[PDB]
């Protein structure tokens, strides 16, 4: 196997890195225009094209978007969380499954896991201290004005949710956030919720929006000192970054080093930034 694609040459948004111990490889699934493409790497530095991990059949509910895939290993299988929409169906995140970290994925159920009555995106998976799965998602600011982030328990098989979605916070609660104007609306974006649990049980959430100071896309963090997914979430006043980058997640590499992965800048030349990250005084 040859890995000839330098990480510096990658052009993509919202990079989620799957660290797969089973095959001892890293996988980067990405939106490749109405399909999900997957690249593979031994070391995060050089990459190999492994083809398409998801191409929708004509009967798939969501024929549009294919935004921001995440892939999780869960109880021996692999689950792709990607956002879609269709004529006559609101945008939402749905879950697809494969026996392999590189796909092919098939729909777990043929509908969004996010609420059908809501425009939603960026559905992600958090596994809590007891091993139980949570869905985190955004309700789009074009609908809500002040963008919203929700949590909701998932059934053990990830096919359905339990209970009602719970509103964690609105984007305006973070002091660094500034409103943007698009599609006739001025409001605050919520993108990319992702929770990392610290050894003491406290939770950090990363998420993205635009900064009030300079209009840059950015990564913000919030802390739930209670260890409760539902909060209360306390927003940190400063963004992690000033490089117009966002949609971040964190992972431990094969050596156990904590890393962050996100794209920067936010237009024209978006590329993955994958770099070590550190926890100090309970936050990033
Ligand atoms: Cl399909
Ligand atoms: Cl995983
Ligand atoms: Mg993502
Ligand atoms: Mg609102």
Question: What is the approximate shape?
Answer: globular
Strand content: over 45%
Number of helices, where a helix is a run of at least 4 consecutive DSSP H or I residues: 1
What's the story with the biggest beta sheet?
Answer: 5 strands, antiparallel
Q: Ends: how far apart?
A: 36 Å
Which architecture would the CATH scheme give at its second level?
5 Propeller
The top-level CATH class is Mainly Beta
- Counting structural domains, the number is 1
What kind of assembly state do the chains in view correspond to?
monomer
Strand order of the largest sheet: 1-5-4-3-2
CATH topology descriptor:
Tachylectin-2, Chain A
Query: What is the H level of CATH, i.e. the homologous superfamily?
Result: Glycosyl hydrolase domain, family 43
Fraction in helix: under 10%
Query: What is the radius of gyration?
Result: 18 Å
InterPro entries: GH43_arabinanases, Glyco_hydro_43, Glyco_hydro_beta-prop_sf
Binding site for Mg(2+) 2: 144
Pathway: Glycan metabolism; L-arabinan degradation
Keywords: Glycosidase, Hydrolase, Metal-binding, Signal
